[PDB]
Amino acid sequence: MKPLSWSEAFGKGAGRIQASTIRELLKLTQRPGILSFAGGLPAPELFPKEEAAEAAARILREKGEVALQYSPTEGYAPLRAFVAEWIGVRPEEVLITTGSQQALDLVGKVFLDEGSPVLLEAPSYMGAIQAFRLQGPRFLTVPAGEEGPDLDALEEVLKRERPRFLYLIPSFQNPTGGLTPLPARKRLLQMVMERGLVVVEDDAYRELYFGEARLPSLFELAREAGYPGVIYLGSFSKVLSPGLRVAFAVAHPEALQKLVQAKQGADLHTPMLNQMLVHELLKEGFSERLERVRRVYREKAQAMLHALDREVPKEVRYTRPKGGMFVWMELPKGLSAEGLFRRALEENVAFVPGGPFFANGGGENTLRLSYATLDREGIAEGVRRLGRALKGLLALV
Amino acid sequence: MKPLSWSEAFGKGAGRIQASTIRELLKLTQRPGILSFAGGLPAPELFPKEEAAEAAARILREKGEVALQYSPTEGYAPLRAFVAEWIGVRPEEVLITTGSQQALDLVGKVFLDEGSPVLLEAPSYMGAIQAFRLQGPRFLTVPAGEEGPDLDALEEVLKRERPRFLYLIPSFQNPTGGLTPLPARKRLLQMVMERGLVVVEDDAYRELYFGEARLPSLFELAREAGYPGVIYLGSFSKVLSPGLRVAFAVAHPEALQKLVQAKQGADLHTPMLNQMLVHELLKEGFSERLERVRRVYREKAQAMLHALDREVPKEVRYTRPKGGMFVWMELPKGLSAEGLFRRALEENVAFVPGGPFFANGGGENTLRLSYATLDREGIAEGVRRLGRALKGLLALV
Numbered sequence A, B: 001m002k003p004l005s006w007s008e009a010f011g012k013g014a015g016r017i018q019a020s021t022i023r024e025l026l027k028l029t030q031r032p033g034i035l036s037f038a039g040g041l042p043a044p045e046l047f048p049k050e051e052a053a054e055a056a057a058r059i060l061r062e063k064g065e066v067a068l069q070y071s072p073t074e075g076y077a078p079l080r081a082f083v084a085e086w087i088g089v090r091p092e093e094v095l096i097t098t099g100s101q102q103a104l105d106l107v108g109k110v111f112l113d114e115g116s117p118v119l120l121e122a123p124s125y126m127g128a129i130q131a132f133r134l135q136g137p138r139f140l141t142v143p144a145g146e147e148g149p150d151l152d153a154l155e156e157v158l159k160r161e162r163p164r165f166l167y168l169i170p171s172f173q174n175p176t177g178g179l180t181p182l183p184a185r186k187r188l189l190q191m192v193m194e195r196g197l198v199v200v201e202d203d204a205y206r207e208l209y210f211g212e213a214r215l216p217s218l219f220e221l222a223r224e225a226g227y228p229g230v231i232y233l234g235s236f237s238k239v240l241s242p243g244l245r246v247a248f249a250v251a252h253p254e255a256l257q258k259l260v261q262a263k264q265g266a267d268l269h270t271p272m273l274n275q276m277l278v279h280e281l282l283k284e285g286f287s288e289r290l291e292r293v294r295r296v297y298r299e300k301a302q303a304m305l306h307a308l309d310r311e312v313p314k315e316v317r318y319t320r321p322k323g324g325m326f327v328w329m330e331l332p333k334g335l336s337a338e339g340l341f342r343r344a345l346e347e348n349v350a351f352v353p354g355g356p357f358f359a360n361g362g363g364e365n366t367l368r369l370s371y372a373t374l375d376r377e378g379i380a381e382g383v384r385r386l387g388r389a390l391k392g393l394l395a396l397v
């Protein structure tokens, strides 16, 4: 017989398919005894388990025939309505998705072809890179700094290339924590409007602001200006339950129709029980829930910064968050994050090495830390161990 | 300002993105008053809504932290073990997917490139066609007949073409209802083994057999032979709940790894609550449940044939199912199924015109009828109305 060799049987796509270190690391971090600063896993004590149990049961008893049946792709109507009210659009402009990860998959399918340019920050969210990579695009990057993307570098890229879209996370970027301030958002919008460019705005961390208010999204600025080119991505993952896999894409009807049709082939539709459950949980008390979310992450972030300031040598650089889940660390004198990873893990501490957040490589001396999962005690202890680990490595470079 | 034009903004991919008529028809059929022979939607009386409610609440109360949190991509351990035991493999060989529709999308990503040959029947499941078409493949088809795929036709294709895989639904195919007999399964396996080819075997309707026993799957026959090239797809959709979106792929470790990594970029993971709920519902009493689902559909099938034999002119031909959800109809004298659909719709009867089930086109005179949803009375009355529409159109052309 002719042998079957898998490497041979695979299409060219398969070579662009690689594991996510974030996804893989969860197998390690969910194990008892690990102090995790790895994945952006929401604080478990914010899970409304009792309320979820009541809501799920009522949905299934009274609306079982709907929760358990096939449903149209666009989403459970009341959820589309609720998202529409919150974001300030019409329901028919909302698509419910299977996590914002799916929306990333969908936008890559709709806009990217082999060799097509796509613009994102270096570093940016590895899951977006992973999703877009499948299409075989050319990644164009600009540095991400404490004030979001380098707009001068962006202006230079735009003189040379026409990206299929710009993928951005203006509000507490994954992984740097950067917040793009209002003037830069307006400058960005101007650059995109002048060139009629598409922006995919990933707003996973929208509500996790630590300060008095949130900044207007690029989507809200675009809507004010009457510009139709911002595709807006939001998620219930960081505010309620990541495991429910319920999120949304809001877009111009032409773009949304393509995202809908791509979704039909991706999974038919997002599980109906899950969408119903989100809507039942959020339809009353959402602002109050969001206030608590903000406080819980603000306190964790404060504990995180207090411990880093005390335990980490001053030669090591790290960002200070104004929101979201992450601190971004840069190691000096050529230290490897993978080296540090090894040491820390021996001390039961996990983080994410920064390398794979760089779509074109580099960043071997960087790492992302999440303060979302651990309580204050665990944050302090975990950072003490990391600090110990760094000093040992710094001693021996 | 350079104008933004969506048709211009889209990649080549977007041109390959089209609506599924199955998915679109749900918008119509789920409205009150319609007698739907359209999508393969299970009978609502089979939804264990009361039991699902108890199970959901207990999962959320007792294991809420797990149900609501991010989880690794492969799936909930006890569900994978459940599947492993049922199918007869190791849990490490099982990937939990967000419905088998997701598995189809993943298989296209791993195996297909622009211009890559892929083999399926004409007609076949339109969702598979939709998922695969994204990659820009060259579709090769063989007729789907009463014994399943035309193997003489396949034998001819294989002398000239090397498909990336053969997509098959041997057990009550969508849309013809055909059952590939054991000798034919054995022949196909020899054909595949000699050439070292991959088969994607879609077993959505596996358990829905009307006769005394089910036939061995291509997967089972390959496993007996020690052949590693069958990727096996199964789902809880046709036996428990389509709305939960919980299914599985089983494959050789190398193929499975690629499916896992592709799924990471597609949605991270299938929601944990849904996986847990499926396992809790089926861990006891699965055999008995399946006995009842076979009964329900067998009855519906009998009603459907009884009504068609009564109401439909003998110049119209249709399949007689031995399992599954569908009857496949072929109109004479080049009568259009789309014309029939318009007439039938005016009388509140819906079905799926057969055209989109043909990956390279044709089949305009065909249609798929599902007896899954309606009860005996609805089936009889719906077919009465279809017969009247059919008889009307038969007179004009």
Ligand SMILES: Cc1ncc(COP(=O)(O)O)c(CN[C@@H](CCC(=O)O)C(=O)O)c1O
Residues within 6 Å of the ligand: A022, A023, A026, A038, A039, A040, A041, A098, A099, A100, A101, A102, A125, A127, A169, A174, A202, A204, A234, A235, A236, A237, A242, A245, A247, B070, B071, B267, B268
């Ligand atoms: C900016 C951004 N967008 C999208 C996603 C996907 O989230 P959805 O739940 O699908 O809406 C993440 C995931 N953030 C986590 C993922 C953790 C995991 O995959 O285990 C992270 O980056 O650690 C993200 O940071």
Ligand SMILES: Cc1ncc(COP(=O)(O)O)c(CN[C@@H](CCC(=O)O)C(=O)O)c1O
Residues within 6 Å of the ligand: A070, A071, A267, A268, B022, B023, B026, B038, B039, B040, B041, B098, B099, B100, B101, B102, B125, B127, B169, B174, B202, B204, B234, B235, B236, B237, B242, B245, B247
């Ligand atoms: C052979 C086959 N495979 C896979 C699927 C995907 O189902 P999953 O629930 O994701 O496992 C279907 C859907 N059959 C129905 C779908 C109806 C709808 O999309 O509303 C049908 O073909 O009517 C199918 O017929």
